[PDB]
Paper text:
To understand how [name] recognizes F-[name] through its [name] domain at the molecular level, we utilized cryo-EM single-particle analysis. We used [name]-[name] (residues 1–201, Fig. 1A fifth panel), the minimum construct that can bind to F-[name], and obtained a high-quality density map with a local resolution gradient better than 3.0 Å, as judged by the FSC curve. The [name]-[name] domain in orange interacts with two adjacent [name] monomers, thus following the [name] helical pattern. At ABD1 (amino acids 13–31), the N-terminal loops or helixes of the [name]-[name] domain mainly interact with [name] (n) by hydrophobic or electrostatic environment (J and EV2B). At ABD2’, the n + 2 position of [name] Y143, I345, L349, and n position of [name] M44 at the D-loop form a hydrophobic pocket that enfolds F108 and F109 of the [name]-[name] domain (E and EV2B). ABD2 had electrostatic interactions with the n position of [name] between [name] H87 and [name] T129, [name] K61 and [name] E133, [name] E93 and [name] R144 (F–H and EV2B). The longer N-terminal of the [name]-[name] domain forms a ‘hook’ structure to catch to the [name]. We also found the [name]-[name] domain is far away from the [name] D-loop because of the rigid 310 α-helix; this way would result in the weaker binding ability for [name]-[name] domain with [name]. Our high-resolution cryo-EM structure of the [name]-[name] domain bound to F-[name] provides the first example of the single [name] domain interacting with F-[name].
The spectraplakin family protein [name] was originally identified as a growth arrest-specific protein, and recent studies have revealed its involvement in multiple cellular processes. Its dual interaction with [name] filaments and microtubules highlights its essential role in cytoskeletal organization, such as cell division, apoptosis, and possibly tumorigenesis. The [name] family cross-links F-[name] and MTs, which is essential for the regulation of axon morphology, cell apoptosis, and cell division. Notably, the [name] protein is the most diminutive spectraplakin, comprising a single type 3 CH domain and a GAR domain connected by a hinge linker (H-Linker, first panel). In summary, our research revealed that the [name] protein can promote MT nucleation, facilitate MT stabilization, bundle MTs or F-[name] together, and crosslink F-[name] bundles to MTs.
Residue numbers in the entry:
A (entry chain A), F (entry chain B): 13 to 78, 95 to 166
B (entry chain L), C (entry chain K), D (entry chain H), E (entry chain J): 5 to 374
Write the structure that this text describes.
């Protein structure tokens, strides 16, 4: 960060731009999901094509074979169906030893409010799935 | 290889890696729990929140601090704050990294024992240490002699050190700090008809004191000035767009550090307690302590407090003593940057408690190494 | 497998299947019985008529609403309306489908108990649920924060919701809605010499209200404008081909929502009940409620009501707040749209009251689960 | 020369002469104004009504309380209530007699300042005083050690006093009292089917509360007993001969004193608020406070409240402590009885504010003498 | 006339008449002043309290000792303690009675001069004397040879005496006694999480010290026993009914007498200081000093201190010497018993300073007679 | 007292039973007050009929005749009127030049907590009154 040079600039960095290494974190996961889902992801499109929860239900359905989970793949963005898909996926994470630190809430994907916690969830799932025959993120 | 440093104060967590210039994470030491009936399903919600996440949605939450007066009073909520620190805010895996923690002097022994146990058993840390907060403020201020005055959210303390030797009989502790001043500001804002009651409204008056409060150089002259004129009155906008206007409440709040009688307690005040610990030191040490009063912690951040402290100690100390106050602009982080300095030293790497010493002596190892 | 959804309001039944975009059946909540000798020809002699066939034959009938102020007052006529809904409008066996019903807040407990009993004992549904109408209107709005104002034929209510949590101490009810506005239009149409008296003539005045009435932006200037000129006057054709001309009665009727004393009530009016409900909420929630006032129900369909509401709340709230009124063109169906969304969710299917757990606990289970 | 004493609360005015055993005047602290058109010459109409005459005519009036939470919110209507008190009830010229007024602690300073201004400018009293009303409850109790709990219509507070010395940092305030319980009983009567809406119907529910409500010793056993049997149900006749029947609403209403969560508050309840005030006192004072918890004011009049308070504090305090609750038969009047005692004492006569030292200092004289 | 004897040490006043076997008055040498706001008029209340009355009211008082380290540091408060002694407790007019006072050795000359002045000018005694405390302990012991160790509430001293001759160059003094051990017990109870801070809470820790503390025969084996076992722990009930448990704090407090390093002093400790005083005496006197170590004063009252003292002195002295420690059951009163003996003797009656010698020579008469 | 023969017996004597000679001090004052005020007093009734302060106001007035002091003679025991009467008497003692030490507080008479300091006050007032023409206690 900016360091001690002045204390106002350091507090402005704590409040926002705090996590500027999020763009690097999206690039690893976009390529990993492009290999694993067979659907093309880029770090610019990453939130804009995950936000209906449908590809994350397909991620669980891909990783599990290596509960059955319900999903509406046709769900539009910003809907209660997009929330409900994402809530099934977050329940599949809670059944897999992830906890309320690394998890996002279903609103946090669907309205884009928690994109760091989406990456931390996908990375925690990757480290657990690595013990059961999945190649983890780069 | 590299250590991590967590200050872990009563009000704010400061955390980051050893050898960094400043903390990487700084967030409030609160957990919050929803206090209202949930009615919408599909929302994937947590049953508790911590840090800036709990601060952000505080209108639906009751807020709890696990630490009060520098003592961890709720261990189940402290383990959530430490888990959030290592896994969200720093992305560590603590199994790989030596951890430096910090504590106030004159704490109960069970606090550093259970803090040692949880690091080795819940987090599986390889090596661990608990430093005294005031000693880290001398590492940050680059010197081996001085009397530190440290005040945070819950504890005020002072520790005289000379040539790297502490004088533990002269150490002082005072259970008046920023939370007591926040509660006294809530009490005196009722004189103007403002009512602040919920744990979320306490966080509003904490922001009011951080923005608008200051230390008077002469208190009776400011009381006469504020009685005679509106010239000292200022306004603050509440989160719903209402405006409060405050006057002498701006300096009557911080004056409680110099007059603990205002919150009902039989205690000398911040100027008398540092003079009294200089006078408990040997006569040949005192001149170098008067020249090296070092201020530390966020409760020392009020405008005018160093000029007030300079004035008050000069009236107590002998004429021809040259009393000096060191109050640097980064002093709200000087415990953490002092821990970052200390954990980096090549001559410190023998001092850690390692996991294989804890497997021999248990939690009791913390009383003989720290 | 599929679920039924019934709005079942004081004025109209709106009914269909969960996951559809709109109700398939929409008809008046009326039962009609002959007011003349029971030996009719051509009119199709049967004891009573429901909904659209009662509205069609109204010249020979007395008309009764089974429900008033959101409370069912004839249970045998309510069983006629539900029997018509499932067997004659939706063309279905209720034995096969979960049924989601709706209620206003602050209703008598006996109403949702007897409603639960009739669904399990008369219609023998496998499962059912009783939702709050305002929470469904927020599902249809696509959001988890807002103060919802609902107004149907019999009651108006508001519920503040924030992050999916309701604040049940901040809920308001007023038993002034569309039927009180119809009865007040019948009263003031007497000033021009028009007499409407029969229950069938109340349905003519309901149609005059729906087509000609609107909300004034400023009432004193609109009163002065209608006194000064004929330009605000409009005409309507009665079922017999006579014409009525209406003037200031056209906006004096809807003004009763903002001035309840026109019909003799002591209550504050809809701009004050929404504001007083925001001021019952915690201070950190209020800014997000001011930005999300969601309108709902057929009595919110008047031209100019959102512009009036925006003006009136902006005069109550602090000038730095950003007031928004959300009033979509679908808002007479948003309770049904919300029920269709909710009954379809994966995360809702554990929330139904099932027949076997009603057999454990009787009607009283509706208080623990809904 | 005889002094006047006036309780001047939210809800009720209690007033009379110092040295009398009880107040002469006791009437509701309301102003009433007509809400309907006076169609008839000599119908009996007058611009406004006060006290018992406003309570008597309430079917044609809107009713307003000028005091809320111990704060005077309408000064024109308080000046009307004081004019009624001196000239119609006591039948006194206030020009002749010194007057003792009373107030709750932690009130805004402008409220005391405006009280002394109106007594010296409008009523032209020779001398004036403003007592803290809980110190007067201890005068009436005949003791000089104890923690007083006072609850009227608008506020509840406690003051610990040790030997005529108050501990002002240990004083608590809770803006939950008798009016919040009346409004919660109105909300709860809607479950049973009864709607009370007007300011006149609030006075009916307030009479139901005073006659039918009681405090449960164990709330979950009374809830289970009420669910199991009709044995606890009671009936009440309304002013028009309709009959209310209620059961668990009788004890769910006053239970909100012990758990403020029922009306949405994030606040501890009256037993915890008494215990927390004792724990803010010096350790040597606490034994005599536990032996001397003194009840005061009309909201402490429920059947079973002293037995509940004894039980709840005994579960918080150490097992070797002797808990006692002093709850006098006359505790509805102990603020006024204490003012009648105090204003009569020969030693008190040099601590009035006189008209001459108000003409020197202005109304802010009240902050230095009282 | 009969003489009167005031021991008048830094912790307790012991007072009575010459020739009595015990003091008639024994009370704490404290003055106390209210620290809180008086709110009830009528009490006749005093602005200051003394002795057991100040100990009784201590929760509302700040307490001060006007003597520290055997020096009178507040003369205004010492004149109140002497006035309370003569007029309330001994109940006698000092103009009729010769008065014997006491002092520690190596005190400043101004202390006995000002004490001499006040007795002849404030109290107008006919005659006066100041004795050294430890020579009175030897009168009470009934012997003319021995080395006395006196320790109280601020000063420890020893004087070797042989055949009625003192050796002034061999007198030793430690300003570590009693009050320093109470302050160290307050410091050390923070390790258990108990916090004692007010002047009133120091009187609680002083009571805990008097009834739970003891001297270890071998400190390392008690530290090993207390680390290994709960069998050394005891409980104390605080004045509010809380219970504190203490363990090694029971013997770590008194060990400070043998290791002054525990409280930050460079000083030698009780055994070494006694041995060093004997070794400053002439070689042929030393045998009778080793046989006659006399213990005196309330800080010598700990269980096991005489057995520890005999063991520690035996390790310093030559193996052929017969070490004996004389520690009477009544040694809390030895100085007063010795003063009651001395003032009664027929050979002492020429040694008083009389008022006529003070009126000739002034206060400095006390350096040539005493 | 007990002497130092048992060291525990003496420390109880200092606190539990320090003035057994209180009754001898009440006996003289009861007969002196009976001579001076005409109201009949005995050492058993002494506290129980002084405790409303009224006869001590009559004492102040009688010793003054041989400030005007206000009094409510009808005051019941244990009241704030009994305190207020006694506070006027204690103020009259301080105007008679008595120091703060031999005096009682008004609670100490009215609740009977300080009967020693009541006797010390009456004796001190008696020795002052002897200089102004009233015969003192025996
Ligand atoms: N500008 C300020 N003015 C006054 N108080 C402040 C200010 N900024 C922060 N504080 C106080 O400083 C506290 C931070 O210190 P804390 O975390 O409790 O202990 P420590 O200094 O050991 O890390 C805050 O919680 C708050 O009470
Ligand atoms: N366009 C409109 N303009 C004004 N009032 C309307 C309009 N459409 C419907 N209403 C009125 O709204 C009420 C019906 O609203 P609705 O939401 O369907 O009520 P409910 O839920 O009780 O069935 C009736 O009083 C009706 O006359
Ligand atoms: N018997 C009672 N039971 C419950 N509440 C009572 C009772 N009698 C009086 N109250 C309440 O006391 C309040 C009267 O106002 P206020 O002056 O503040 O109280 P007070 O009676 O102590 O003078 C009202 O809320 C009233 O309903
Ligand atoms: N049982 C005891 N155990 C420990 N300390 C005691 C005990 N009893 C009394 N003390 C201490 O001894 C002191 C003796 O009184 P002090 O005034 O100093 O006169 P002195 O030195 O002559 O004995 C007390 O004030 C107290 O500090
Ligand atoms: Mg810190
Ligand atoms: Mg409807
Ligand atoms: Mg009242
Ligand atoms: Mg001594």
């Amino acid at each position: 960060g900016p360091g001690l040079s002045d204390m106002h600039q350091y507090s402005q960095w704590l409040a926002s731009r705090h996590e500027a290494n999020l763009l690097p974190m999206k690039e690893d996961l976009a390529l990993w999901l492009t290999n694993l889902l067979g659907k093309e992801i880029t770090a610019e499109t990453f939130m804009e094509k995950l936000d209906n929860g449908a590809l994350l239900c397909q991620l669980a359905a891909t990783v599990q074979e290596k509960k059955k989970i319900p999903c509406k793949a046709s769900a539009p963005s910003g809907s209660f169906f997009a929330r409900d898909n994402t809530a099934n996926f977050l329940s599949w994470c809670r059944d897999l030893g992830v906890d309320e630190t690394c998890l996002f809430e279903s609103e946090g994907l669907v309205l884009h409010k928690q994109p760091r916690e989406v990456c931390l969830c996908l990375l925690e799932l990757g480290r657990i799935a690595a013990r059961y025959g999945v190649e983890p993120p780069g | 290889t590299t250590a991590l440093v967590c200050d872990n104060g009563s009000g704010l967590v400061k955390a980051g890696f050893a050898g960094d210039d400043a903390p990487r994470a700084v967030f409030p030491s609160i957990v919050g729990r929803p206090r209202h009936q949930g009615v919408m399903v599909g929302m994937g919600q947590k049953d508790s929140y911590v840090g800036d996440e709990a601060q952000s949605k505080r209108g639906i939450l009751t807020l709890k601090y696990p630490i009060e007066h520098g003592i961890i009073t709720n261990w189940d909520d402290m383990e959530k704050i430490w888990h959030h620190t290592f896994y969200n805010e720093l992305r560590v895996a603590p199994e790989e990294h030596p951890t430096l923690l910090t504590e106030a002097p004159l704490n109960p022994k069970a606090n550093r024992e259970k803090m040692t146990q949880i690091m080795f058993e819940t987090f599986n840390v390889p090596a661990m240490y608990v430093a005294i907060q005031a000693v880290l403020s001398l590492y940050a201020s680059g010197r081996t002699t001085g009397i530190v005055l440290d005040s945070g959210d819950g504890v005020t303390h002072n520790v005289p050190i000379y040539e790297g030797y502490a004088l533990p009989h002269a150490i002082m502790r005072l259970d008046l700090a920023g939370r007591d001043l926040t509660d006294y500001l809530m009490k005196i804002l009722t004189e103007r008809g403002y009512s602040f009651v919920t744990t979320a409204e306490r966080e509003i008056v904490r922001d009011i004191k951080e923005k608008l409060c200051y230390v008077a150089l002469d208190f009776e002259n400011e009381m006469a000035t504020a009685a005679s004129s509106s010239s000292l009155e200022k306004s603050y906008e509440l989160p719903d767009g209402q405006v409060i206007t405050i006057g002498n409440e701006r300096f009557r709040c911080p004056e409680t550090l110099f007059q603990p009688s205002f919150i009902g307690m039989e205690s000398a005040g911040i100027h008398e307690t540092t003079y009294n610990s200089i006078m408990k030191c040997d006569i040949d040490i005192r001149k170098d302590l008067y020249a090296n009063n070092v201020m530390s912690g966020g409760t020392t951040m009020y405008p005018g407090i160093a000029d007030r402290m300079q004035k008050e100690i000069t009236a107590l100390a002998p004429s021809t003593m040259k009393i000096k106050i060191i109050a640097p602009p980064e002093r709200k982080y000087s415990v953490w940057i002092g821990g970052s300095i200390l954990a980096s030293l090549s001559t410190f790497q023998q001092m850690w408690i390692t996991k294989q010493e804890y497997d021999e002596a248990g939690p009791s190892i913390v009383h003989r190494k720290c």
